[PDB]
UniProtKB/Swiss-Prot annotation, chain D:
Record-linked Gene3D superfamilies: Glutamine Phosphoribosylpyrophosphate, subunit 1, domain 1
Chain segments annotated as coiled-coil in the UniProt record: none
Name of the featured protein: Proteasome subunit beta type-3
Family: Belongs to the peptidase T1B family.
Keywords linked to the UniProt accession: Cytoplasm, Isopeptide bond, Nucleus, Phosphoprotein, Proteasome, Ubl conjugation
InterPro entries: Ntn_hydrolases_N, Proteasome_beta_3, Proteasome_bsu_CS, Proteasome_sua/b, Proteasome_suB-type
Subunit (UniProt): The 26S proteasome consists of a 20S proteasome core and two 19S regulatory subunits. The 20S proteasome core is composed of 28 subunits that are arranged in four stacked rings, resulting in a barrel-shaped structure. The two end rings are each formed by seven alpha subunits, and the two central rings are each formed by seven beta subunits. The catalytic chamber with the active sites is on the inside of the barrel.
GO biological process, one term: proteasome-mediated ubiquitin-dependent protein catabolic process
Swiss-Prot record, chain E:
Gene3D superfamilies to which the protein is assigned, alphabetical: Glutamine Phosphoribosylpyrophosphate, subunit 1, domain 1
Native organism taxonomy: Eukaryota, Fungi, Dikarya, Ascomycota, Saccharomycotina
Entry superkingdom: Eukaryota
Family to which the UniProt record says this protein belongs: Belongs to the peptidase T1B family.
Quaternary structure note: The 26S proteasome consists of a 20S proteasome core and two 19S regulatory subunits. The 20S proteasome core is composed of 28 subunits that are arranged in four stacked rings, resulting in a barrel-shaped structure. The two end rings are each formed by seven alpha subunits, and the two central rings are each formed by seven beta subunits. The catalytic chamber with the active sites is on the inside of the barrel.
A Gene Ontology biological process term: proteasome-mediated ubiquitin-dependent protein catabolic process
Key words, A-Z: Acetylation, Cytoplasm, Hydrolase, Nucleus, Protease, Proteasome, Threonine protease, Zymogen
Protein name: Proteasome subunit beta type-1
Protein encoded by which gene: PRE3
InterPro entries named among the record's database cross-references: Ntn_hydrolases_N (IPR029055), Pept_T1A_subB (IPR000243), Proteasome_bsu_CS (IPR016050), Proteasome_sua/b (IPR001353), Proteasome_suB-type (IPR023333)
Record organism: Saccharomyces cerevisiae (strain ATCC 204508 / S288c) (Baker's yeast)
Documented EC number(s): 3.4.25.1
UniProtKB/Swiss-Prot annotation, chain H:
Organism: Saccharomyces cerevisiae (strain ATCC 204508 / S288c) (Baker's yeast)
Name this polypeptide is given: Proteasome subunit alpha type-4
Residue list for modification Phosphothreonine: T55
Homology family: Belongs to the peptidase T1A family.
Protein task: The proteasome degrades poly-ubiquitinated proteins in the cytoplasm and in the nucleus. It is essential for the regulated turnover of proteins and for the removal of misfolded proteins. The proteasome is a multicatalytic proteinase complex that is characterized by its ability to cleave peptides with Arg, Phe, Tyr, Leu, and Glu adjacent to the leaving group at neutral or slightly basic pH. It has an ATP-dependent proteolytic activity.
Subcellular location: Cytoplasm; Nucleus
Quaternary data: The 26S proteasome consists of a 20S proteasome core and two 19S regulatory subunits. The 20S proteasome core is composed of 28 subunits that are arranged in four stacked rings, resulting in a barrel-shaped structure. The two end rings are each formed by seven alpha subunits, and the two central rings are each formed by seven beta subunits. The catalytic chamber with the active sites is on the inside of the barrel. Interacts with CIC1.
Shown chain mapped onto the complete sequence: 6 to 122 of 254
Additional information: Present with 16800 molecules/cell in log phase SD medium.
UniProtKB/Swiss-Prot annotation, chain I:
Localisation per UniProt entry: Cytoplasm; Nucleus
Name the record gives this protein: Proteasome subunit alpha type-1
Self-association and partners: The 26S proteasome consists of a 20S proteasome core and two 19S regulatory subunits. The 20S proteasome core is composed of 28 subunits that are arranged in four stacked rings, resulting in a barrel-shaped structure. The two end rings are each formed by seven alpha subunits, and the two central rings are each formed by seven beta subunits. The catalytic chamber with the active sites is on the inside of the barrel. Interacts with CIC1.
Record organism: Saccharomyces cerevisiae (strain ATCC 204508 / S288c) (Baker's yeast)
Alphabetic keyword roster: Acetylation, Cytoplasm, Isopeptide bond, Nucleus, Phosphoprotein, Proteasome, Ubl conjugation
Amino acid sequence: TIFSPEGRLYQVEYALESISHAGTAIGIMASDGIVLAAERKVTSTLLEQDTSTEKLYKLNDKIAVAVAGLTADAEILINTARIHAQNYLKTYNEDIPVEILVRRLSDIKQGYTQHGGLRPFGVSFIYAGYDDRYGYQLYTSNPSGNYTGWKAISVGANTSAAQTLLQMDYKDDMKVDDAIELALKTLSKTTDSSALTYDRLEFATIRKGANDGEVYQKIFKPQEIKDILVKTGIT
Amino acid sequence: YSFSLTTFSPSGKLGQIDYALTAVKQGVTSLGIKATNGVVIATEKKSSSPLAMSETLSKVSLLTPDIGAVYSGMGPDYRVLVDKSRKVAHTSYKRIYGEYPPTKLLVSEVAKIMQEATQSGGVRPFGVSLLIAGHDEFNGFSLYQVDPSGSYFPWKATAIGKGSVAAKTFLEKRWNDELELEDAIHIALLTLKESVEGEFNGDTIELAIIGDENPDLLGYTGIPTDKGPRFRKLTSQEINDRLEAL
Amino acid sequence: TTIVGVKFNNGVVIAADTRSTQGPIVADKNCAKLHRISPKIWCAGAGTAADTEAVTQLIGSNIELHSLYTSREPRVVSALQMLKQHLFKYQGHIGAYLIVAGVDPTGSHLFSIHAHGSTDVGYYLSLGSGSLAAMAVLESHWKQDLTKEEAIKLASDAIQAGIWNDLGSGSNVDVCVMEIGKDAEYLRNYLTPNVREEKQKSYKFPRGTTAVLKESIVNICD
Amino acid sequence: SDPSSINGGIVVAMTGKDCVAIACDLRLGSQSLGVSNKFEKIFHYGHVFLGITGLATDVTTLNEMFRYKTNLYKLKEERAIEPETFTQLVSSSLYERRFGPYFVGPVVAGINSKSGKPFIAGFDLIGCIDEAKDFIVSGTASDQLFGMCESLYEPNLEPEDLFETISQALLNAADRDALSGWGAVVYIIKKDEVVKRYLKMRQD
Amino acid sequence: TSIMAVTFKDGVILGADSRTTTGAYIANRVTDKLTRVHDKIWCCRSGSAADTQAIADIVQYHLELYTSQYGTPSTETAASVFKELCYENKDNLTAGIIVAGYDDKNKGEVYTIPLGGSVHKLPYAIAGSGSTFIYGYCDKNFRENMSKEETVDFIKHSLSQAIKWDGSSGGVIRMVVLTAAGVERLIFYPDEYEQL
Amino acid sequence: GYDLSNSVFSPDGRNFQVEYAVKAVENGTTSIGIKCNDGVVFAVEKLITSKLLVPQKNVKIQVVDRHIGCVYSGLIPDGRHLVNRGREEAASFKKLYKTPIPIPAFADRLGQYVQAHTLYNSVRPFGVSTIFGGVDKNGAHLYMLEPSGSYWGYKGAATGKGRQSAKAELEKLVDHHPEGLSAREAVKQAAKIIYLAHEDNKEKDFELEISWCSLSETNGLHKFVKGDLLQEAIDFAQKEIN
Amino acid sequence: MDIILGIRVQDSVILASSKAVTRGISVLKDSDDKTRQLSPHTLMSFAGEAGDTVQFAEYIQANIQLYSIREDYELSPQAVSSFVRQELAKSIRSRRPYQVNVLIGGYDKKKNKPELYQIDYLGTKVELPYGAHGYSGFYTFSLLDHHYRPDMTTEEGLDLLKLCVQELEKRMPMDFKGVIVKIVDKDGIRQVDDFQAQ
Amino acid sequence: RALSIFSPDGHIFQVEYALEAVKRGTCAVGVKGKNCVVLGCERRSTLKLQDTRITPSKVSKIDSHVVLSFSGLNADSRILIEKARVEAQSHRLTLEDPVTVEYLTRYVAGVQQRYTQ
Amino acid sequence: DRHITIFSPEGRLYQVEYAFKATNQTNINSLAVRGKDCTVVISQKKVPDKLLDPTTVSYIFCISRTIGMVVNGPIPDARNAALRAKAEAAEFRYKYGYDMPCDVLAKRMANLSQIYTQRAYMRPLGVILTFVSVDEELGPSIYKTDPAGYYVGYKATATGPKQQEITTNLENHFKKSKIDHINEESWEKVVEFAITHMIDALGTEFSKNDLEVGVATKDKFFTLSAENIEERLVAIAEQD
Ligand SMILES: [Mg+2]
Ligand SMILES: [Mg+2]
Ligand SMILES: [Mg+2]
Ligand SMILES: [Mg+2]
Ligand SMILES: [Mg+2]
Ligand SMILES: [Mg+2]
Ligand SMILES: [Mg+2]
């Protein structure tokens, strides 16, 4: 938790490096929903993708996060994330606002940055969430404990590559079906492997169906990914 | 020594974690294969002397009447991990819901135990990798592998330690989603044989399965909700009976 | 409540009635008071029910672990020593009065623990409000060297003593036999003598009898 | 002074053929003073209903506590909790406070989504579980309720009939209780659907 | 409860009734109040069954360890342990204990740890509710360096009296003989002690 | 680099820091003890750096409880520390068991404590070696404890600089008197042995210090040798010194 | 005890509170304000034990103000009250409980509706059209129950309040030295300085 | 373990390095007029596709009348801000008067200093 | 990487490894074998300094009424292990109501060793522990644990610098006899067998002051004295 002669936190910087070696997570915030897609790290024909959950996690019925980094490190933060959510609900009888949850998670990370002498968490998060004050939101936090919010963003491997591709095809008035497409597109053009296949993807969306009122988080099942893949044309 | 002993190195690697994984690589092979109506985990009883008694070393342990674990790495680290695991199955679960946790959760708890070794001050990671097999009313059957990092993932079949790659390859070919337990046991046996140097029999092998409920192992008759534990270790004789059918 | 533990020639049996009462009201006309600590170690409890259940499960759990860790079948003296040290710890506040019976490698055992943490050993014991009616029977028909069948009858009758003569007991009889060579057999409702007779009429109301103000569907799913 | 008799209120739960029902009155008062006639004591976490009677602040608290708990349970387990499970949760949750209890009396009711077997259960302020297949009652009019139940109840009633039975039970029992009434709510729970009805009753 | 321990020529004997009551009810009529804290150090227990059982269990443990480390403990030491426990926790204990033991250099020795937690070494001691009645009888018939036979009777007489008068005492008379030759368990029935 | 932190095991399985501690010991005054027929004598060499020292005042032998005598060589303060702990350990033993601590018991107590200081790098081993003993329920006992925590029983023992000369002298005694040695003799003998051992440091004038715990001369209690009994042995040593 | 009354009409919530502070034998003050503004659209009135009363209200205030800053938002009345309930429900089992009762009136800018909450020292919270604490209910509820209507104007409510206060001055034994009335509506919190005569 | 310690030249490297971190942070400026103060800051442009709507602004209200902007580790700021807001309410609650800009300042300052020793 | 118990790039724990070397520092060998209804452990006794009181030199300890333990390693670390062994044994009894099973005691001790292996501040103990007893459930027993936190049960075993010699000797005996124990009804003979096979492998003769024997039968473990050893030593000088 110390400073370099250049005014940088070694462990944090190095933590970030580790992260860049992680699969890519992409979050694209649309007008009527948010999309999260992520490429799985190290797989096989024998790995059970069906009963799997390694990059996309539900934090609250209205908030989900995509992870890039140490899965274990992630889970620790996630649990305490799920808990703060519930505490807030007990205290106020209202769902926790996305930014509050996000800010809270970040401050924990920052802690590891300033005091203690424990290695930071080698994890970066993308938070896709909704609430009555700001509607849909997409955020990101990294080991420094810093967080910021985007219309589209990605983490892990080949960030610059992907961000550039996103900034290229992203437009303010988008729609989910399109964001899905773009998300996949980008992953596809930034992968380090042969070709995007369902067995290598994790995908999830947060939509507010017009024929109702509450936000529905849907984590895509392996088959559905394969399906969404054909339609967008990756074949 | 209150500071993390596992720090991030300039390339983005967790030294002690990778080294621990190295230690795991040098351990005896252990595998697990998941069938449709069961799971099997096996390993080899590397007698470090013929004066030692093979049985006084359960390399395959029961964690709950429906979940078993086998490893590859430093045994001691596993022994204490089994203890903490059995305990937490109780404290964080049976003592709250009156039933044992589902595999993924227990797995998740064990994971948590190892991650903390990856970050708490003054410790070294656990030098082991475990294959945890189990069943539960809602998720059915499952097999999980847990690493020193704290990373865990589900497998249809896998092997860890020494000949892991070769084994994983043999498994990759033989496994299919229509396997009945006896067959997986078979394959487990076959797969095990190739990594086993010396004598291959019921006293050098350790198989255990997670299958149908065994009322005969319950210990009492009466209450009809719990029909018995699904975890059963195979006997030397039962093992041999299958070896002879190679 | 009435619970008895009777030791026989090669095992031990324990039984109890099945009436739970909040004050003078029969809350559960058939609760179970026979707990399992380990497959072959059972105990019956009276006093604050929540306490007998709690202290039971707690020790059972710690007993399951000690076994796993020692790769040995559980022992009654351990269950005993543990209960007694915990109960004693709580100076009487954990109102659990128990008769713990069971078989293990060393043979059969039968003990009783009073909520303050004192234990006793004997060939036959009983506890609860029906304690005296039951002990009256045991003190009249018990003899050394009972067969498995004689003990069941005995322990069974004793519970009946309490059932008929004690307002605090009633309903049915539960038995649990722990024979040495065999598996423990829990006989739930070994005896059922108190069956309510057919009501004299049907109080099935004709539909629509009740006055409703507002109706609506509740949403369960997410 | 008895925390369990300050706010008043009763709850009852019964099982029928492929369904369960659970009802409660609506009065919230402070001793003799009626304060609110809109205090439902029945709550649900998915397809499991918990009715709680007793000191109202505790009724509120516990409800808050079990949501929280059932919520995390769902996140970790990826499935909704079951009656039987919830029950042990409630119990253990109450015994946790064995020496400074929540002055309440809970009643659980629901149907296991896998087995379909109807289920209800009840507890005293410290977790002592009461599992009976017929009915469970709690509240200031417990004695009353038992009387009504023991007489009105008969097994395997159809949803439509159980309804009447439980309503009557509740209704007349409440009429003999000072601290109860001012309205009633009844839930008829089936595997697939759940109907909630308010009853018309004396407002005194 | 009626208990006493008498030291004689060959050692010491501990005797006690076998009745534990909860009010006027005889919860247990075949209680064993003679407790082994060590091979040749036993104690007689009077007071709260729970309090004493616990204290005993603890002394038994402290002594097992003492042994492991430093060999066989003296009776004086067994006493000191009991005293320590009884005295330091006086506020929460109702226990009066008699510690009797045998040693080759000291022969038999007897210690009584009364309610306040104090310790007194005596030739014999009596305690328990029934003891009140036999102070006279005992102070009269007791002679030092008696034979085992004589001692057995003196205990058998004193205690039959105590059982006669005190209702909190009865059942059978149990004894424990501690001499160089070993440890002997004796039991006398009502049919015998009742008419003496 | 295996000699910079305490608890570190070298590639040969030795704890270097312990070993250096021994050096601190070696550089110190000589002290000995002689187990006799029914007691033990302790003696030590007090180096008189200058005339400014008040004679017979800076006592170095110490007592634990009332029956254990203690003398050590090395870093004096470290010894005092060890004794204090001995005293605390002794009391706690008496408090609970009434009987004063048996020497073997006491020894193991000191041993366990010292051994502990070679278990963590946050502590340095004790820069001392102690010779102590006394009388108990069954005989006399003399022990010597080293920085590693090792301790064994002796018939005679010595330590410090004149250590080898002394041991040589002690060995003679064990071989010439297997029967035992009267407390009086051992006293004189210790006096001699010290005078002798003093030659390894033959450059400064010294002050001898002796103490004993005999079942017949001091009732089993530890007392210092002073007055008539002390001059007697001073001269005995001054005699056989040529 | 003191009087604490609230009644939420259609567009606001009126809260009236006795102005007297009694300490033993004498009336110390005849012009006390037993309320604090939690946020600009949420007001809380309170009555109970001497110190506890203010100490609790001020605490709640500070805590609600801090949230408004940290978040740049104003909690809904509902939110503000649940928070208060929880703080009370926590003290009932503490070392020394805050013996305090409060009413919370707020205008929910989001919903565009007025809201009145009643919470007792125990953590018993309830939402109602009109409410009060202590004995105040006993004399006025009968009147409120009779004349209250959801579509009341702010004026209609103030009259109903007046009537209620009248009954209290008629049948209640202690002199509470009148009331201080405040209205909470969309435009904020104003003090009806005309309730001595209106 | 003492991180911020002195050097042979009389400097606390960690503190000095801290400054460097400040240098790398975007610019912030504030100038005070005759009856007002203005604070301006430049927005960070490493990556662009930001949702300005929500992004943590660089200027934060400590209280209805006091603000604070900074330059440096965006994370480290949040803490100073929180502790400052909390102390703003706390001053009100015990002195019955909101903080003076000086006080507020002296507070946030004291905090930083503490972290140096 | 070589001063505290953290991993080396090869995945090893050097300090653990060096601890194993310290176990040999004393230069004593011992062995243990199981009888029909007992268990014996012989260990060499070497009293160098003439000034030492031979009676206080031992590496064999009475852990409890039924458990005996022999230690191969420096005396300090040895006693440190003993004291805890004793305590753990007592506590077990107090809390569970039956004597601690030797194998259980061993596993316990092993778990404690594993800890020094995982926590940097604790150095392992440079000693190897052999626990013996006649378990009420398992019969004659021998469980050995080491600085790595490893422990296992043996048909018979040996420890010391000349470990392999002794082992091979015994390995041969059991391969010949086919059973996992000496087939003698009395301990005296097993002790004999033991000393015999010790002499056989080490190629040395023993007097009474060069041995240390420990025996464990149902309900008790004791150490023979010089005189008792002699009766053994004598009886052997007739077969060989
Ligand atoms: Mg009855
Ligand atoms: Mg009631
Ligand atoms: Mg009513
Ligand atoms: Mg009598
Ligand atoms: Mg030497
Ligand atoms: Mg270590
Ligand atoms: Mg260390």
